[PDB]
Amino acid sequence: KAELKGQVKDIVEESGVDTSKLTNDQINELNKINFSKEAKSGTQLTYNDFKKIAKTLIEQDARYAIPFFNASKIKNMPAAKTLDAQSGKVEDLEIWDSWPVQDAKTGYVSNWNGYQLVIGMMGVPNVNDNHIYLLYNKYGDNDFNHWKNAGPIFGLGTPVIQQWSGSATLNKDGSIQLYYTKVDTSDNNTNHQKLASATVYLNLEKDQDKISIAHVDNDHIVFEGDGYHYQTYDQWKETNKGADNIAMRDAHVIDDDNGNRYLVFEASTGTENYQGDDQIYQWLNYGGTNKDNLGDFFQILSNSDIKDRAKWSNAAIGIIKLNDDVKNPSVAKVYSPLISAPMVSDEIERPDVVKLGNKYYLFAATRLNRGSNDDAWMATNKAVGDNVAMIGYVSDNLTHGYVPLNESGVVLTASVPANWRTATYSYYAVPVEGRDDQLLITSYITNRGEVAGKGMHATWAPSFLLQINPDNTTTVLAKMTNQGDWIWDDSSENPDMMGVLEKDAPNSAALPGEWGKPV
Ligand SMILES: OC[C@H]1O[C@@](CO)(OC[C@@]2(O[C@H]3O[C@H](CO)[C@@H](O)[C@H](O)[C@H]3O)O[C@H](CO)[C@@H](O)[C@@H]2O)[C@@H](O)[C@@H]1O
């Protein structure tokens, strides 16, 4: 005959719940709730925020929905017909997560000898073939056909050592300082990820408008996690049943006004605020009204899969400061996470920080199906046929204090099914010279692995403008570019790339055979 003890008594009464209708089991569970107010791991994507993001996605609100693309205009990247790192032969690769070489303070796409430079993950569809390649075009050239491939940064290789996403900026001497994810799969095929850096020197043959990779120097591991702020591989190994995600990837370089250099990356929380059964009882993870939190608590407890996911979810967007050894960096300081999602999601990807005026904007991509709340993300699949989103936050300070945009953190939401040609992911905001209140959203279009059909390859999406509002909101704009345009200027807009959600329109968001096809 247990009795409610402490703050939870007040919670139950506030919620209009009849205390005598509670079982002993329910009372015992309620008595385990910890009402501590102390935030342990930065700004949180709470259970309520997640529910709101999913709900907003289902609403397909023009403010946040990814614009429809003209499906008939989407092509595989010509520069993706290229030597493959794992075969040494010319093959038709697909291309996904990509990033421009950009100025570290402003994020502006860098002009290197009249060229723009982009590094991206490419490989053969349905092969474990994860390596990074250098692509280049004349600076400001909007023609997707003009991009060329300088080849894989690290030359030929195998799945034992992979390269996943990062960022890149120029050194004073004209070399590229590349930040990337080195992945070692030698321990029972696990994706053992580490933040790495290398210096890339280029050869330019002016008359052939041809760039090649000349030297790759100083390749080394920068950060693997500290164990307190961020989970280490050894920590992950200790407890993994198969249900725990590994993350130490997607490093985004940014410099502050004083020239200090930071990497903002995807990880998981360490012992500062670790995953586990205890997370279900931390009231601060819920983030709704007390009454809604109470409903959520019982929902998690009553659903075995949700409960399991809640125990393992601890995605974080971390930050470290580097020392001043630009070409051979070491870690100078490890900070608490900027954002974390204990209890809520075990995957938040591709973080991107842009300084606009005197404020820092942090965006990240996520697939809501990696969230703990199955009921919420399953509903997004039912409504739209996909569950992708971009989330966003703003701070007056680079290393802490982030506030969610559009209340919940929602910024972009999926608008077409995941297996359509015009599905997108890996949103990456790029600042726009001469427009300090807008960002150009780049992404890849078509999901990997021929899910949209044989020959339909992941390729660079048409880019679109996002309006940033000083009142901590954002608005998708009806302004779109050619595929693979990283630089918004006065020749960038191409309204022909815009689509409509109509079966038989020439600019349909669906290719023939997709409208009404199973997801
Ligand atoms: O390719 C690595 C690169 O992709 C990112 C997201 O852009 O991680 C994505 C991720 O999932 C992709 O691949 C899985 C197949 O297992 C698929 O289910 C999903 O639809 C894809 O987005 O890639 C790794 C390995 O597959 C997963 O850990 C991760 O979920 C980015 O963070 C990373 O640099």
Ligand SMILES: [Ca+2]
């Ligand atoms: Ca986890």
